[PDB]
Write a structure and sequence with these properties.
part of a larger assembly; 6 chains; A mainly alpha (185); B alpha+beta (119); C alpha+beta (411); D alpha+beta (132); E mainly alpha (98); B: 119 residues; alpha+beta; OB fold (Dihydrolipoamide Acetyltransferase, E2P); five-stranded antiparallel sheet; 29% strand; elongated; C: 411 residues; six-stranded mixed sheet; 15 helices; binds adenosine-5'-diphosphate; binds beryllium trifluoride ion; binds magnesium ion; binds zinc ion; nucleus (chain A)
Chain lengths: 185, 119, 411, 132, 98, 67
């Protein structure tokens, strides 16, 4: 067992030592959530502009420092119109005088940042109420957190990777991790 | 948990404790780093071990058993799930339950007149 | 026109029907065109054959709807076609009244455009533009089948009700009092049906070949076999071996829709050359994200955090009144053994003196929501609640959508 | 026939009575550690005897671990650390356990039958105890 | 470990039942026990019981048919106040009895 | 000497060193205030009483029992 008397030095030895030898993440989480919220492949590259506009961080800088991973057309209007041509067509209307002249600037305005921000029509305080106020502030976590295998969800054997630190459980998960999910390798 | 070690790195405080021991465990088919709790690294300080040394770890007991040095060729999974079967006569459990000194009593035979209600 | 029209818009699907019939009419709210460019009517994607590569162009986005002309086209299709809607009939709709639902958080300008359009092109004689949570406390006005779950145990409308509403767009929590929801205590859940579909696609890519191009199949599998973990995650994980289901993919030539082959049943003995994707691990993992978002490695607080924040910031006298009435409305609440888990984990998380009491409706909860808005019209308060054309006409267009239908009014 | 009281919940507080009033006789401190018994369904701060706190020290409890105590005897047993701290250590001898379901204060009654001579020997000779 | 199964469900402490008097003589004078036994002060908890169940019965006669009901207490501004007051007074009652 | 203690006031900081504080002792029929000596200060340092508690002290041996 343990030796009652052991070699002890003064210069290199210390009681505490025992050695024997031979922000950005939040951005990644938000981006992976929002890209997992996007279905169409063609819609993948444009939504980072939405993320940058909502977050307020510069688009180009976070785009360079973070690696991820139209709908309206007159012809489309035409084939959709003929699709249900059994019954179709409401009536719009227009008037005159300076009020309707000004309404011309807002009727069929065709304004879009990517879909719709592009306006002082929404107040900055109202913008904070819409976006910055609804989300919770202090309750970061109440319930316990569970970390399982990144491949199959196994939890009996917990072992983080040595290169990327990813948790692996089984031998198969380890052997398929190194070449596919272990980017640092 | 049985596998060869790669290195031992224990984080701590010079005077405040705060011990956070880490050591990579390798075998024929894994190379895994493990964060060790206070008890395991207290033991690892109790028994002197080196990086190339191989040890066997049991989760519940926390005891450590080292047998050889790069002598032993470990293989297989670290989290080997094997049973331990123990046989015993009811005399031993009777003596143990009779008295807290029953361990050394049966180890030395100086028992006697166990109450029949225990039986 | 004594019976109004009941329209319950949705980002995924719009519920609509007259005030007379019990069952609302169904119509998806999305426009899809094939890779070759052949657009399909929103009610006709279910009729097409090629479902491999489909790009969806829906007017609704993650938050709301923007394309006014496309949406108006959709409504014109859905309310002018009696030939494909049996029993239904609506020619012009002048005197016909409207019962329209909308989000509690409508944008000012978008609400302006919506009310302008509905009033001036659809000539609604009177209408009530209000969120579902306002119509919720009118459930006691009628007697019918209704089920309840107890967490602890193993006028003509109510006032103190806590509303949980989940939809494909998102999920919301609403405390309502006297019929007016407590707006500042209303919170949003970012996880929607689209996020669920995307995460199923990613997990299938990591466990099978690439089905990111496929979208209908993912919705089908999340609709027909996804179930909530009855107690916890670890017990389901250990018992996932016995809870294994195999889904036969639909061959484009013989079967438009696939089938899930249960190993425990022998009623399906015919073999198929088409490959079968086995499912044993993801059956309960997806609904566990509501209780434990961390299994998806996301930084969302969670349902329990949101509910505790909303109750704690709510006045203390009405918090037990809130937790005395919980009702689940929406499509996403149709998963089995879900609200029982909610009751159990609330009861664990709520103090002993309080009693958890959540009531669950059978079948689709969106249909029950349509029913409750439909029966709200029969209530004597609706005829007082409805607003006519003139009050919109003489007054400024912003007044009607800011005072009576404005969320800022009750903030 | 006998009746006892049941308590459970996880541990966060290890503080004695603050005793803001010195009164001229106290350098305010006591061997009575006030613990808010954090069960998910209830919480209460208890002035605990030196014996029950000594048994707490015997278990060497830390912040965030389920505990089980008695009103009368003060018996202390812990099912283990909570599952919240399971991810903190890759390995740990202490078992990570969930919080048992139930109220903080629970009352149970027993009608156990005990023969006369077991009480005879217990009265003639005390059975045992955890203390030195 | 196979022997430390739950026994609190079926074990008698027998120490709180003052039947271990052989160890009581270590730190007890006879006259102190004699005077502390005669000061078994009843009716001090019973007077609190009396002052509490007056309010308890008043509340029960006022709103005991609806506050205790789950349906009425689910949506009622002040009926839940009666319900929780009744629960609280019962809780203090049986705690004082304990 | 049997009597319920009313209050205890010791000047352990203004003067310290067993300032001979005064404690008031009550009974159901009579109540008096008793001086506390230095040795009594040390005695009351043990078997600590925060008042609001019935204690008795032997007249001869001066031993205080907390009832
Ligand atoms: N029976 C069911 N089983 C599983 N999921 C369902 C079921 N019914 C509906 N859902 C889910 O609910 C969502 C429908 O949301 P819905 O409430 O229609 O949104 P909206 O509020 O915009 O109408 C779909 O994405 C679907 O995945
Ligand atoms: F409007 Be949604 F799809 F909840
Ligand atoms: Mg909707
Ligand atoms: Zn795994
Ligand atoms: Zn790796």
């Amino acid at each position: 067992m343990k030796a009652l008397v052991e070699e002890i030095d003064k210069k290199t030895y210390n009681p505490d030592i025992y050695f024997t030898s031979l922000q950005q993440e939040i951005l990644q989480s938000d981006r992976r959530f929002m890209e997992l919220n996007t279905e169409n492949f063609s819609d993948l590259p444009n939504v980072p502009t939405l993320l940058s506009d909502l977050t307020g961080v510069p688009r180009d800088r976070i785009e360079s420092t973070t690696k991820p991973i139209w709908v309206l057309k007159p012809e489309t209007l035409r084939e959709i119109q003929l699709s249900y041509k059994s019954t179709k067509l409401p009536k719009p209307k227009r008037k005159n005088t300076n009020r309707i002249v000004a309404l011309k600037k807002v009727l069929s305005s065709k304004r879009n940042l990517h879909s719709f921000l592009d306006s002082a029509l929404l107040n900055l305080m109202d913008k904070n109420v819409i976006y910055h106020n609804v989300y919770n502030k202090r309750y970061f976590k109440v319930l316990p957190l569970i970390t399982t295998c990144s491949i199959c969800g196994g939890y009996d054997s917990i072992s983080s990777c040595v290169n990327c630190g990813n948790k692996i459980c089984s031998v198969s998960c380890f052997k398929l991790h190194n070449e596919t999910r272990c980017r640092n390798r | 948990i049985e596998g060869e070690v790669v290195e031992i790195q224990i984080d701590r405080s010079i005077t405040g404790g705060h011990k956070q021991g880490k050591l990579t465990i390798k075998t024929t088919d894994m190379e895994t780093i493990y964060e060790l709790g206070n008890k395991m690294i207290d033991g690892l300080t109790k028994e002197k071990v080196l990086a190339g040394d191989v040890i066997s770890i049991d989760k519940a007991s926390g005891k450590i058993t080292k047998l050889g040095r790069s002598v032993q060729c470990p293989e297989g999974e670290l989290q080997k799930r094997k049973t331990v079967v123990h046989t015993v006569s009811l005399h031993e459990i009777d003596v143990i339950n009779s008295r807290t000194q029953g361990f050394l009593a049966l180890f030395t035979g100086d028992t006697g007149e166990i109450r029949s209600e225990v039986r | 026109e004594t019976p109004p029209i009941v329209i319950d818009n949705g980002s995924y699907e719009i519920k609509f029907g007259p005030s007379t019939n019990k069952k609302p009419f169904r119509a998806l709210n999305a426009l899809a065109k094939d890779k070759f460019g052949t657009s399909y009517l929103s009610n006709h994607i279910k009729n097409i054959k090629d479902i491999s590569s489909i790009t969806f162009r829906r007017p609704h986005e993650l938050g709301q709807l923007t394309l006014w002309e496309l949406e108006s086209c959709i409504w014109d299709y859905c309310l002018f076609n009696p030939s494909e809607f049996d029993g239904f009939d609506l020619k012009e709709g002048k005197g016909h009244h409207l019962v329209a639902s909308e989000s509690c958080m409508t944008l000012p300008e978008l609400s302006k455009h919506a009310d302008q359009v509905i009033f001036e092109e659809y000539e609604f004689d009177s209408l009530f533009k209000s969120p579902v949570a306002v119509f919720v406390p009118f459930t006691k006005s009628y007697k019918g089948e209704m089920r309840t779950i107890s967490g602890k145990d193993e006028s003509d409308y109510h006032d103190f009700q806590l509303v949980i509403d989940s939809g494909f767009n998102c999920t919301w929590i609403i405390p309502v009092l006297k019929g007016i929801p407590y707006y500042k205590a209303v919170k949003k859940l970012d996880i929607g049906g689209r996020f669920l579909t995307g995460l199923l696609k990613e997990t299938l890519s990591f466990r099978h070949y690439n089905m990111m191009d496929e979208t209908i199949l993912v919705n089908n599998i999340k609709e027909q076999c996804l179930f909530v973990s009855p107690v916890s995650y670890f017990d389901s994980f250990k018992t996932k071996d016995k809870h294994a289901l195999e889904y036969v993919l639909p061959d484009f030539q013989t079967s438009f829709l696939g089938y899930v082959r249960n190993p425990r049943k022998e009623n399906v003995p015919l073999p198929e050359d088409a490959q079968i994707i086995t499912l044993t691990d993801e059956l309960f993992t997806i609904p566990e994200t509501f209780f434990h978002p961390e299994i998806s490695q996301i930084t969302k607080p969670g349902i329990v955090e949101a509910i505790l924040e909303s109750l704690s910031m709510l006045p203390e006298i009405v918090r037990p009144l809130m937790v005395g009435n919980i009702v689940c409305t929406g499509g996403n609440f149709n998963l089995p053994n879900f609200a029982q888990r909610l009751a159990a984990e609330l009861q664990r998380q709520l103090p002993t003196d309080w009693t958890c009491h959540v009531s669950v409706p059978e079948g689709d909860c969106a249909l029950f929501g349509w029913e409750v808005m439909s029966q709200f019209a029969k209530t004597d308060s609706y005829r007082k609640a409805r607003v006519t054309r003139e009050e919109y006409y003489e007054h400024g267009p912003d007044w009607c959508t800011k005072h009576r239908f404005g969320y800022q009014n009750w903030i | 026939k006998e009746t006892k009281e049941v308590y459970e919940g996880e541990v966060t507080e290890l503080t004695p009575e603050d005793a803001e009033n010195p009164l001229g006789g106290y350098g305010k401190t006591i061997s009575h550690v006030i613990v808010g018994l954090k069960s998910a369904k209830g919480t209460k701060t208890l002035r605990l005897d030196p014996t029950i706190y000594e048994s707490i020290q015997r278990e060497k409890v830390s912040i965030g671990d389920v505990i089980y105590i008695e009103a009368n005897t003060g018996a202390v047993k812990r099912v283990g650390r909570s599952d919240a701290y399971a991810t903190e250590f890759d390995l740990e001898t202490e078992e990570y356990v969930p919080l048992p379901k139930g109220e903080v204060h629970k009352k149970k009654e027993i009608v156990q039958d005990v023969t006369l001579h077991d009480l005879d020997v217990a009265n003639a000779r005390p059975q045992g105890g955890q203390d030195v | 470990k196979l022997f430390k199964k739950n026994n609190q469900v079926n074990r008698v402490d027998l120490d709180f039942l003052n039947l271990v008097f052989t160890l009581n003589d270590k730190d007890l004078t006879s006259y102190h026990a004699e005077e502390i036994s005669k000061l078994t002060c009843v009716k001090n908890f019973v007077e609190e019981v009396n002052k509490l169940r007056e309010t308890n019965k008043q509340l029960q006669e006022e709103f005991g048919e609806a506050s205790f009901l789950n349906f009425q207490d689910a949506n009622q501004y002040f009926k839940y106040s009666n319900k929780q007051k009744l629960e609280g007074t019962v809780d203090m009652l049986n705690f004082l009895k304990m």
